[PDB]
Assembly symmetry: C3
Homo-oligomer: 130 residues x 3
Amino acid sequence: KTRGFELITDYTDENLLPKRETAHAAGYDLKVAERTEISAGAIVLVPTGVKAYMQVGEVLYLFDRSSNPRKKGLVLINSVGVIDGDYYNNPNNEGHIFAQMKNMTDQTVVLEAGERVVQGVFMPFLLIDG
Amino acid sequence: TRGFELITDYTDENLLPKRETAHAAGYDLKVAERTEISAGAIVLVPTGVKAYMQVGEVLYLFDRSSNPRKKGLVLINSVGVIDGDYYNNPNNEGHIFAQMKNMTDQTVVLEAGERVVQGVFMPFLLIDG
Amino acid sequence: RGFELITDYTDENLLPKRETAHAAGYDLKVAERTEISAGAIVLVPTGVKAYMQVGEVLYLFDRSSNPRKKGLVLINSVGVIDGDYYNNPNNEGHIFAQMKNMTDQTVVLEAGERVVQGVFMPFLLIDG
């Protein structure tokens, strides 16, 4: 056991466990855990149904999917989700990963359960002196 | 090992990215042909290049700092994630586009050769199994 | 690698730290009270510069709470702080966060407020 995703206790659909679309893709595609509506101009935390574990010195970044803005009118409003290794299994929400999405359009957008919403990439990070 | 090549549709070697300084992380990708972006619109801006890399490597595209405050443009998906197998794909040869939104109320024109995003190559890690 | 105060600031409270023992990011703070008008973009001073090794980069990311709590976003999405920005002759490598106020009221950032998170990472070079 090194790094990866697990379903949080609140979800049991293994379809939500992220996979890479191609053999050399950097990103794991996280999915919408339950139907989620986003009103015009609103920001909504979209549940992903999963938590992520990793090694010390590793981080998981969540990036928007390319098609979100031009096809769905949605953007990851904080640009990049920074998921720390100690978020996993925290006592507050078990490390459940949410995507903070904003609807840029003037009509309500609905994300169906199972739709891919962000891509996650695991990477090393470095520490400052001392 | 890793780097950029012109796609077959473009021949101006000026488009091949370089780093602005010797210790910069990013390679500056340029606009391949004059591209207009209407007020409030999102446009895929051609860069004229494709990128190859090793297994376990990814290329990220980031906005240039000056884009929003100087040009009124932003990279609307925030970070472009260019996978190693995008290179030479049968659909568009792995041609890298920058998805730019014009935040202003006037048409913005990007001239050929203008720097538009910066690309950084980095390692990534795989999940168990 | 690490952070130093620029010569213009002396409050060591501005030196970034990680919030938890396994966090990826160092929390950079607002160096002086900074107002951002409705819909405006403002370069927010952080009071620090960053040194690192060759082959290393410092990325600045938005704080999760900025958009939904404060109505602010890092307008260039990710700040890319190069190793040779440090001690440049123009501004000493002073790191600014380019923040946009999405709301219809002026937002004020107080000195000492956390504004972005910095992560140090390796990068790779092209052939030749």
